[PDB]
Amino acid sequence: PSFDSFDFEDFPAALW
Amino acid sequence: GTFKDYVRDRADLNKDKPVIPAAALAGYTGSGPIQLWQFLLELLTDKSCQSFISWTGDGWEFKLSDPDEVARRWGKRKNKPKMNYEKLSRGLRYYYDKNIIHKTAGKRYVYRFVCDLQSLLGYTPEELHAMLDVK
Amino acid sequence: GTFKDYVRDRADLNKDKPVIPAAALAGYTGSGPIQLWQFLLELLTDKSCQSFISWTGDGWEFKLSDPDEVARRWGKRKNKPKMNYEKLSRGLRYYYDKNIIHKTAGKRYVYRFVCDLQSLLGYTPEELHAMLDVK
Numbered sequence: 001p002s003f004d005s006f007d008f009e010d011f012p013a014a015l016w
Numbered sequence: 017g018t019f020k021d022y023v024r025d026r027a028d029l030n031k032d033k034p035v036i037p038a039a040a041l042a043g044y045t046g047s048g049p050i051q052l053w054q055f056l057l058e059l060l061t062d063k064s065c066q067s068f069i070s071w072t073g074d075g076w077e078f079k080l081s082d083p084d085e086v087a088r089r090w091g092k093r094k095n096k097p098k099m100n101y102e103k104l105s106r107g108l109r110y111y112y113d114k115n116i117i118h119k120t121a122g123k124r125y126v127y128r129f130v131c132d133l134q135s136l137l138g139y140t141p142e143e144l145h146a147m148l149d150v151k
Numbered sequence: 152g153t154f155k156d157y158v159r160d161r162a163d164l165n166k167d168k169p170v171i172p173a174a175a176l177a178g179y180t181g182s183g184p185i186q187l188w189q190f191l192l193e194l195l196t197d198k199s200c201q202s203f204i205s206w207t208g209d210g211w212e213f214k215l216s217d218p219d220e221v222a223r224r225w226g227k228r229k230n231k232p233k234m235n236y237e238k239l240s241r242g243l244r245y246y247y248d249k250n251i252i253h254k255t256a257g258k259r260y261v262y263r264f265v266c267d268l269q270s271l272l273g274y275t276p277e278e279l280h281a282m283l284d285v286k
Contacts, residue, residue, distance in 0.1 A: 001131040003045060004114070004233065006052065009187055010245035011107045014094040015049060106245065113237050 035061035035147055036137065038093075052107055053116055053129075055090060057137075063148060071150045075141045076129035083125050170196035170282060171272065180271075187242050188251060188264075190225055192272075198283055206285045210276045211264035218260050 007013035026032050038050040038058040047054070059065040060078050068082035080086050083101045091099025108127070111117040120126035134140055144150075152160075161167050173185035173193040182189070194200040195213055203217035215221050218236040226234030243262065246252035255261035269275055279285075 001116070001136070003047060003051060003053070003116070006107060006110055007231075008110070008238070008242065010242060011103065011110065013049075014096065102248075106241075106248075109241055109244070110238070113241065 029064060031062075031064045033062065033064075034058045035139075035144060050093070052090070052104075053111065055093065056086075057133075059086070059089070061144060061148060066148070071141070071145055071148065072126065073145065073150055074128075076133055077120060078127060078129075079123065080125040080127075164199060166197070166199045168197065168199075169193045170274075170279060185228070187225065187239075188246060190228060191221075192268075194221065194224070196279060196283060201283070206276070206280055206283070207261070208280060208285055209263075211268055212255060213262060214258075215260040215262075 005013060023032070036054075036057045038054040041054045041057065042048060042050045045054075050058075056069070056078070059069045060071060068085040069078065069080050071078050083104075087099050087101040087104040090104060091097055096103075108117060108119075112119065116129070116131050117127050118130045120128055158167070171189075171192045173189040176189045176192065177183065177185045180189075185193075191204070191213075194204045195206060203220040204213065204215050206213050218239070222234050222236045222239040225239060226232055243252055247254065251264065251266045252262050253265045255263060
């Protein structure tokens with residue numbers, strides 16, 4: 001199965 | 017104290033020895049930063065975390081005995097000091113829509129991985145259960 | 152074509168004239184990037200969007216005639232080409248949790264701002280409706 005990004009206004013993904 | 021001690025002190029407490037490290041799994045899947053579902057698998061396979069999160073014994077099903085502590089560690093790991101269980105739950109809702117994790121209706125704080133983690137991880141749930149001494 | 156054409160063509164279609172541009176509203180509230188609730192107030196006050204989203208006539212209540220188109224533009228505005236109504240619907244749930252937008256009972260794709268938009272915007276619902284020729 002695939003795992004697309006989980007990034008949203010009400011749940012923002014972190015990066016740095 | 018120093019980082020050398022931080023590692024040594026935590027190694028004495030049997031920390032930092034999960035079967036499925038979130039960072040390693042991210043390199044396997046190529047996601048770069050670790051994602052929430054990988055973070056959960058790390059705790060679920062880290063004996064030093066069985067007090068607040070653990071497998072139930074039924075396949076890929078698990079429960080958050082201390083939901084706040086899981087949100088606290090997730091915040092520590094992603095540099096989100098304002099992380100709480102409300103926001104973490106909000107995120108799990110997106111995992112529902114994607115059929116990655118499902119809520120076990122009838123229990124509180126109990127979920128299940130419904131994606132084919134066996135074909136992905138190469139482990140069966142029972143295998144990890146024995147490695148972790150699940151009751 | 153060029154940018155001067157892209158702006159002229161859209162002008163001939165009576166686009167780019169929303170009473171409440173999300174960007175202007177964001178600067179007014181100091182939120183930086185536009186938020187979903189601001190993006191919706193832009194479509195709801197843009198006559199060129201009344202085909203897929205519009206007011207119903209009962210205060211701050213509105214309906215999404217084409218829920219897919221609304222999720223498509225929100226995708227283009229945040230560079231999320233995989234945006235769909237299911238993800239957008241979770242977004243609106245956040246505003247429900249925060250008592251900013253509620254769902255109309257027994258009706259699909261019908262919501263209402265339950266915050267005090269009149270004190271924030273300086274507009275009444277009826278005032279906007281008249282400006283937008285709402286039926």
